[PDB]
């Protein structure tokens, strides 16, 4: 006979929409007022003698974060004043005095013919640029250098982009399903369900190369990848401990402020105090010595058990993935990492330059650029390297050695290397079963 | 017949030939995000139409 | 105490059967940027309300297990009724009926209709 | 089988009798620029749901017919049985008694509350 | 008649016993600027349906009033049942038992679960 | 007794909020990234014993097919660069040397002082335009013509404007009832009644006087109107057979960009390859010489069964109602229709010049001026009227001969010509009857 | 025994969205185009044998009148003209030859070099302006005062702010309960308990001071005030009895279009037909006379029943709060009250001169400044004050006599005059009662 | 007394006469959709006041 | 150690001693809603650090 049950704990995989939630103000773009707060205590349910299917390469939950990420940087800008009446002719010499060699040509000393809130009159003002976002008009007279591409918004100053984390939960009739397992390596049943209501939080650092802010494997570094012998793929390293790096912006800076027109004025590096000096980061030398021969020995246990394995730096391209990008303070660094992969694991302090930049394509759209306002004083910023993106070169037959390279561009992958853990299920609580019974 | 289609994993990106002068790259991986590498060069499927 | 989905890996017998189902599993179903806090609300809604409109049309709301005079078809798996209880759990069963699905809801519905029918005409008659 | 609206040339004894209003009449009645597609999601809620409360009002949910003890008023609308359920069909019939809706749903109301007093009274006494 | 809030002050033995509680009530319980418009039809929506939810897990759906086989306790409140119906009003009563509220849910949850339980007994038996 | 039935079948006449549907990309402005696909399969159940009442004329579908595309359209150019720094007084003189007669004075060449995305010198640019778009400013000096009116924004050459169609379909608890019938004449009610979940779909081609791209009447031309001896009304003239039209706009155009600003483009009419030729229709002749008369002996049916009637050609007045307006392409054509309404039919090939614009004020809005950009090569274009907005003179009692004008102007007359088929109503299953049972 | 009951008449505070109502156009700021319209008939039940405790120092009402007012009032100027093109420099004299004295320096008479819809060629214009508008620039010539802190929008001339009242309405489970009694004050319990659908409808009069077209109190006159004794509070003063004031703006207005752009036009002052005369009020003397006396009554019975009350006029500050505001016709008016505040109470016509402003920054946000158009011809308003916002000066413990000012500044205090009537519940029908029943 | 009206299926558009030149053209008829046409003029409905 | 914060029902602000010239007004009474008066003034809490 059949019986009618209702309330069954059973459930299909699923595609749904979820909630973002924030701490159980107007500041920080990362939607802190448009968040809900999060539930005030875990509600993780082990789940005994049963086991669960995860693809972390088929996930969803990776495309509402990139969604929602690139929508509300967007929302940060709407309200914001735009720089159209900068983009002038600059007259523009080289700062110097006091640079200490390794910042020549650095910094450019430009003036500008520019409004007033005043309609007719212009002011001559002055102000300070990196080079990278200058360039010469004619091959005296520079343009932004971004001007004959798109436009470019002013970041209000009012807010950051602190990594506030961000938990994800599920609408009624939706659970999320996690791994506790340690073996699990993104595909394939584990034999660890845990349903909860929410993710834990997941800061969303915006980085390439280096994986900052993150978890940290607990036994060993594991090492993911879509599909290991495909050399067009990229590879999820998780490190089991953390690397520390201190990074600087080592100038002492003025900021000020020029008035543009009714109600808008631009933020203009005014000038540094003291003397002029290349921003880097200190990467301790002896964690990335141990911590790179972990990875290497996790390499060769997916491939290369008896071969070699050299890291080279990065190829020539676009600066966005060539360095290493990071955002600190609100500031844009890129960062030289070919001190990072310069060796060869066969078995048997580091300082990193960097540069800077005010305008941003953050996601490479058209219209978009956003200027990176100046912050004053000096900024010191401490962060732990949870993890890397590599590649391996391909072209060669010659197994003796593998080569790999720091990677990163697609911002998906940073979010799968914390989102794997869990998985999105609907709940069909309806159905039947045979029974002895009848009405 | 066929055409100059990317292999998987590659898309089309004119902009990565034209602004670095590299060879044999009229393809680009998506496993850079779009944006230009050397080591993301590819050129077509090779078969003729 | 079991949790939202605590009872699954209890087999059916116990799984559902200790009204697990009831506690928590049925218990949670229903329980310009923010568009998508209403797009959630009002789909969970439509799935709560499904399940008891199809409760309803078969004679089963009010009820967390429902017995109707319907017979079991065996051709559509055939076991033992204490295996089937005992040892395995509804995603497990799952995997095995959910292809008869379509063919117990219109069989429901018919005995449902038809069970009516009787008491309407008991009444007539009455 | 029949379709939606189906049903609606059969006259009442067999357009709705034969349960046809519940196989698809009641099956389907719950089955920025999108702003209008919630509008419509949650329309089509409420109304299910105000017709779900009525009945539930009555006495009268999970039943696809559902008779009271109101008598019915022949001053409302005087027909003999057979034609009003054999000849005649349901649109024809509201166009005849429409205007007695809100009188019924009245006595309705009442003749439930009633009833249930009279089952508390006999669960006192009991 | 009396209105929605109408019978508040009739005391619980009229003020809601004369199923004003459903005549009005209940009754009217479920009865880009204007975001606000959905908002307000939704929560409208969950509210309703988290009641019926209740009702239907303990067993008392198409209910006024619904008699369970829980016993009271006057652990919560000890008080006659003629004051308690007759003197007092509902707002007053909920002063009085809300923080046993919880309590009571529980307890009503179980015994339906046990009745149910029992019922599939029966009929296996049967 | 008593006895409360629920899931009738019975329904009133009702308004709501219609879902638009097709396909069961960001190209194409007639929401194809908005509405939902359509339901794969027909769900027409044709309903037996049946009558229903129709009234196209009180029809409210049409007011959500106007509200939608009119919204729809307006949505389209929101992301769209605005033409504001154009408005310029053009040094303007005529095109000359290859025109065939037929254009000349049409094409004016213009040059301007444009900016650049450096805000502060100007490029000396010039293109070409259709006369209609240009003015003089000094009873040379010229300035486009809507300057003086309201604001212009180009159509962003990404999208435009095929009339791909869309499905309308009912929300639960709602319904659309359809006419099989062939007497039907918009009116009253009709013997034949078929429910479905959703319309078929309609083209939403916005065009005056010749219907295009419709359905066709199956057995008689059927004519309709909202009162036959009202001449403020207009009629619709549904065909029971097609006829086609060739159009053309004979000239291979070359497009080029001027840039305006930081990230802003202007498309301009470059020049043409070859000579110049005019714009024109080949409209069969011999099919609108069949058509004519069958369209005359159903006006004589509803009056004038022993009179005779003419056919004239529109009246003085706004080009976008005295003469033919279609788009093809994207291109905005003007066309001579005279030639088709030069007869009288007393019982008892058509070639059509055209013009083009390139500023179009659709439906008729202020700050909403849309440029259309040009279109590189030669455009074809081929479909068939299906139909006939007429008017009808007044002034006259001499019954003898009544006169017909080609009309439109309200867009709703259209879309009326294809929603008439439906009609919404809405379901209210709950209700009683009398019984011999009680409970 | 436990018995669950359902449809309990019992309810809890709450906080929840309410309904706008009006009615039951695109014209009207105060969303008339989208509130819903009344329920035709008043649905008020009163109840009998209960009581129910009332704070409108802690209700939401207001703070949803709040939003609701500020989101209204800054979605009005969401499509209109921007008056950034204006702020240039004015070269401006004075208004001269007509003025009766009291005016003189109040008008300015400036000329301005302005846009055309052509960008290139600049039109000589001059306008009238109030000189609180305009300030020098160079300690001739002059700038909107307001163009050097946010920008400008001119209000289209399509719409006004009369305040036509708006009831609020509970969405279903939801309930406003009411007093209908005459010595409540604002807290604690009244016995008395009316319950509504809908608030009456409230009128967003927009005030400093005297608070205008509300309701009145039917007995006394209330005071209310949080805490009495803290100085830090204003008081609301409710009249019993109306005082009307006859107010003018006694120039017979020419108005102007000047076209700036394309579908862009500014509404300038023109010149007054006639000579030239200051604004001002009438307000009745006796009535005031007697309105004071019974104020003060009811101080004295709160405080100081054997002491005297002092009134004076404003302390020197903000024009938007020292001086009585208003707005009129949709002009706004400045009102020197001192004429009403120059006295002492011991027991045992008067006109107010007034100035008006074009640019108002309501509610003091940037980028918000309003321009406000002239309005033509003259403009006459009559209303009655019902009511007072007063503070009381601190600073002294000699309690023989106690001074009190005319206040205002924030609104919500204005809003709070009215909703004090209500407060909203929340109902919960479901509980349970024990029983001699058992199922 | 009396306003001027335009008969039903007509609307009241100055833009008409002043464009055109034309004659006893006040209202203009609703069927033409704002658009202006001499078939479309008409007087005001022809009533004293 | 203590701030220089301002007292219940006053909130700080800058603008009005600047823009008027007023002595002992650091904080300014929220009764007025943002708006400089002289008789809205307030020094600090007076409490030492
Ligand atoms: C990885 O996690 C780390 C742990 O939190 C992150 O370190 C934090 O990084 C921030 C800087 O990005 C550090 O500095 C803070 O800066 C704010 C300054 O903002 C305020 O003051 C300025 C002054 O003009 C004003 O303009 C702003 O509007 C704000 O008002 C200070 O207020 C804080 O006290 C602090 O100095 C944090 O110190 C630092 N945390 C720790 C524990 O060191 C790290 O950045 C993360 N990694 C990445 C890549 O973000
Ligand atoms: C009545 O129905 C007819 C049947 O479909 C419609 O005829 C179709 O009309 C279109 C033109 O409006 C014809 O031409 C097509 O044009 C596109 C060109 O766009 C793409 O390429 C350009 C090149 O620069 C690029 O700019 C665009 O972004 C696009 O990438 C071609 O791709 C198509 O192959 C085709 O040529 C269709 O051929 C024509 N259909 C048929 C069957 O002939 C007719 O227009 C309808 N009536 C009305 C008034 O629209
Ligand atoms: C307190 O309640 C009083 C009672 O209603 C309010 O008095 C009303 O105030 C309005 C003015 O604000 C009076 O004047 C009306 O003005 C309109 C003019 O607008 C139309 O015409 C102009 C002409 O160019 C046009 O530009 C506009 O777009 C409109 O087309 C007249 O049409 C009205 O007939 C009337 O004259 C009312 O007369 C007056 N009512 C009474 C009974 O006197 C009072 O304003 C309220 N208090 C406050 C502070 O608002
Ligand atoms: C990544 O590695 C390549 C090779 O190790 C570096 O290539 C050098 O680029 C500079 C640029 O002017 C050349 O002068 C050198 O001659 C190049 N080296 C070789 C071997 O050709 C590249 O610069 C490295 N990138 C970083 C960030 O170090
Ligand atoms: C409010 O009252 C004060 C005092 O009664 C007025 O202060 C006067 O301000 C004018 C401004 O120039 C001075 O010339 C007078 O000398 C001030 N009076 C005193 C006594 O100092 C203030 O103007 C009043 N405000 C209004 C609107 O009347």
Known sequence: ?439 | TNKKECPEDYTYNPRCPQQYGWSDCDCMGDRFGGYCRQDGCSNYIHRST | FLGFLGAAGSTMGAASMTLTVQARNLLSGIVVWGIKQLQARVLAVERYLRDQQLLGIWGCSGKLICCTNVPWNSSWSNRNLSEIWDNMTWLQWDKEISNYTQIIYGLLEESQNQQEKNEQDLLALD
């Open chain 1, 1 to 439: 006979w059949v019986t009618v049950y209702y309330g069954v704990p059973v459930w299909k995989d699923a595609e749904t929409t979820l909630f973002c939630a924030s701490d159980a103000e107007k500041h920080n773009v990362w939607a802190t007022h448009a968040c809900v707060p999060t539930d005030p205590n875990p509600q993780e349910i082990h789940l005994e003698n049963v086991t669960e299917e995860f693809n972390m390469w088929k996930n969803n939950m990776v495309e509402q974060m990139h969604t929602d990420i690139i929508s509300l940087w967007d929302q940060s800008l709407k309200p914001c004043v735009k720089l159209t009446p900068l983009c002038v002719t600059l007259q523009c010499t080289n700062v110097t005095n006091n640079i200490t060699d390794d910042m020549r040509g650095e910094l450019k000393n430009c003036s500008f013919n520019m409004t007033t809130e005043l309609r007719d009159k212009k002011q001559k003002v002055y102000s300070l640029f990196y080079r990278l976002d200058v360039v010469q008009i004619n091959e005296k007279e520079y343009r932004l250098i971004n001007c004959n591409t798109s436009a470019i918004t002013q970041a209000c100053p009012k807010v950051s982009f602190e990594p506030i984390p961000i938990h994800y939960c599920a609408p009624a009739g939706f659970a999320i399903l996690k791994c506790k397992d340690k073996k699990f390596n993104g595909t394939g049943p584990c034999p660890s369900v845990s349903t909860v209501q929410c993710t834990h939080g997941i800061k969303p650092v915006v980085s390439t190369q280096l994986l900052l802010n993150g978890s940290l494997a607990e036994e060993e570094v594991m090492i993911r990848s879509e599909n290991i012998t495909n050399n067009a793929k990229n590879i999820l390293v998780q490190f089991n401990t953390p690397v520390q790096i201190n990074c600087t912006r080592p100038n002492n800076n003025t900021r000020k402020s020029i008035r543009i027109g009714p109600g808008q004025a631009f933020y203009a590096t005014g000038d540094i105090i003291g003397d002029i000096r290349q921003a880097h980061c200190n990467v301790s030398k002896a964690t990335w010595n141990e911590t790179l021969g972990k990875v290497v020995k996790q390499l060769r246990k997916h491939f290369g058990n008896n071969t070699i394995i050299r890291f080279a730096n990065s190829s020539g391209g676009d600066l966005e993935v060539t360095t290493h990008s990071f955002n600190c303070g609100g500031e844009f660094f890129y960062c030289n990492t070919s001190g990072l992969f310069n060796s060869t694991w066969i078995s048997n302090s580091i300082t990193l330059p960097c540069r800077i930049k005010q305008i941003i394509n953050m996601w490479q759209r058209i219209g978009q650029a956003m200027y990176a306002p100046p912050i004053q004083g000096v900024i010191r910023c401490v962060s732990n390297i949870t993890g890397l993106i590599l590649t391996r070169d391909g072209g060669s037959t010659n197994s003796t050695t593998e080569t790999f390279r720091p990677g990163g561009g697609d911002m998906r992958d940073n979010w799968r290397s914390e989102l794997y853990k869990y998985k999105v299920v609907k709940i069909e609580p309806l159905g039947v079963a045979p029974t002895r019974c009848k009405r």
